[PDB]
């Protein structure tokens, strides 16, 4: 089979500048008809891949003119002349000159924007859950930048680390922010033996954490 | 527009077979090649094979050679992918793609899970608590993936953050959040809609203030 490899972007790109995404193949993709069989895709989280360029240089219907494709028979480059926040996602190249058509491992693009503090929101367990016998405390740190963030759970003033589960989203396509979810799962027996519950966010915005808490 | 509509998520046991479907509308089904590709969780894309819908002629990637069988029924304009002797490694998202331009139009995502574990529906819990109040729904203890979460039947797609699921004791847990002004809520209703195709379950939870 033909093997295809892609490069990586070092760091978040600056808005307005140009970005190059490169791809190389173990064999020539130039076919005997003079066309080069290479596709470029953009895949967003939870969506199917979107075809951007085929035949290595022809833009798909409706694709922004900021995207252009070029290359030789083994080295190919996708160009984003004026990158925008809507361009974040994972880019794939693909060869279609010989079966099986193979893809590269993908190249992730993140964009830089102004620093933003997380919007913290804590939720006590619902009555429906307590009836079942569970007690989950949920904390949302939403629309912050950049992605480097830590979260700390304190029960009545003592740090809590057992029973906490986290989930992070990829960069948002509209405002270039990140969001995280932190859920503390306890027993209906354990939640009732404490009064204060706090979720704290440590971020590059502040020296000291941002705290949202509640007392049962 | 050219449309490819895909089968719902399925849960199957090791050794069994499953048939996924891809239905073509608003274009001549016989004209274009149909491609089948697989994307395993966290991994990249991999071509399974392709079929000509006019004669049933197929070409397979040898990695999926004896495991997969592509067929086409012209009367219903539907392509079929049979996966035999399923393994845990076959748990993945399966896409169909067609068009004059190859891989132009996709649709898709049939999440296939092979785990010998029994399908369990989720419990949906409301998360009730300024300028912008934040609400949410906790979707806990379901199997297998996926769960699709909407708010007010897609009307509030702005300000929504549906987080990736976490696996714990062989069950998944997911959380979704929505942010609206203080003016509409609680004066106007906010409902989270959770669909779990593997169990044919739909759950709607209206978010109501605490007392």
């Amino acid at each position: 089979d033909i093997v295809i490899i892609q490069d990586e972007l070092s760091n978040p790109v600056t808005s307005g500048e140009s970005v190059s995404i490169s791809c190389r193949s173990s064999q020539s993709l130039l076919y005997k008809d003079g066309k080069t069989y290479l596709n470029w895709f953009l895949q967003r989280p939870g969506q199917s891949p979107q075809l951007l360029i085929y035949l290595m240089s022809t833009r798909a219907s409706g694709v922004s003119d900021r995207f252009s494709g070029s290359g030789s028979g083994t080295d190919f480059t996708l160009e984003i002349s004026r990158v925008k926040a809507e361009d974040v996602g994972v880019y794939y190249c693909q060869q279609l000159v010989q079966h099986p058509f193979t893809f590269g491992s993908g190249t992730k693009l993140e964009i830089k924007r102004a620093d933003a503090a997380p919007t913290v929101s804590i939720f006590p367990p619902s009555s429906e859950q307590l009836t079942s016998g569970g007690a989950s405390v949920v904390c949302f740190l939403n629309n912050f930048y950049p992605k480097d963030i830590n979260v700390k759970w304190k029960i009545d003033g003592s740090e809590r680390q057992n029973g906490v589960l986290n989930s992070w989203t990829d960069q948002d396509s509209k405002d270039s922010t990140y969001s995280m979810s932190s859920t503390l799962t306890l027993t209906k027996d354990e939640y009732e033996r404490h009064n204060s519950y706090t979720c704290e966010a440590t971020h590059k915005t502040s020296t000291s954490p941002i705290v949202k808490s509640f007392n049962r | 527009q050219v449309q490819l509509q895909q089968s719902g998520a399925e849960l199957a046991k090791p050794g069994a077979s499953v048939i996924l479907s891809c239905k073509a509308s608003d274009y001549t089904f016989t004209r274009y090649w149909m491609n089948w590709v697989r994307q395993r969780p966290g991994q990249g894309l991999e071509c399974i094979g392709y079929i000509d819908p006019g004669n049933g002629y197929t070409k397979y990637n040898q990695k999926f050679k004896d495991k997969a069988t592509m067929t086409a029924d012209k009367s219903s304009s539907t392509a079929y992918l049979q996966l035999r002797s399923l393994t845990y490694e076959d748990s993945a998202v399966y896409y169909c793609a067609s068009g004059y331009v190859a891989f132009h139009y996709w649709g898709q995502g049939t999440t296939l899970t092979v785990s010998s574990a029994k399908t369990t529906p989720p419990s949906v819990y409301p998360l009730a608590p300024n300028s912008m109040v934040t609400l949410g729904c906790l979707v806990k203890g379901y199997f297998p993936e996926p769960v699709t979460v909407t708010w007010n039947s897609g009307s509030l797609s702005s300000g929504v953050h549906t987080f990736p699921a976490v696996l714990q004791s062989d069950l998944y847990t997911l959380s979704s959040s929505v942010t609206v002004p203080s003016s509409p809520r609680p004066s106007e209703t906010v409902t989270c809609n959770v669909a779990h195709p593997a169990s044919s379950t739909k759950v709607d939870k209206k978010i109501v203030p605490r007392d």
Binding site: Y31, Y37, N39, Y54, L55, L96, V97, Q98, H99, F101 | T30, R31, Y32, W33, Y50, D52, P53, G54, K59, G99, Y100, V101, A102, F103, H104
Partner: peptide, 8 residues
Amino acid sequence: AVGIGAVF
């Protein structure tokens, strides 16, 4: 079958 972009 008819198409471009791939060598079927």
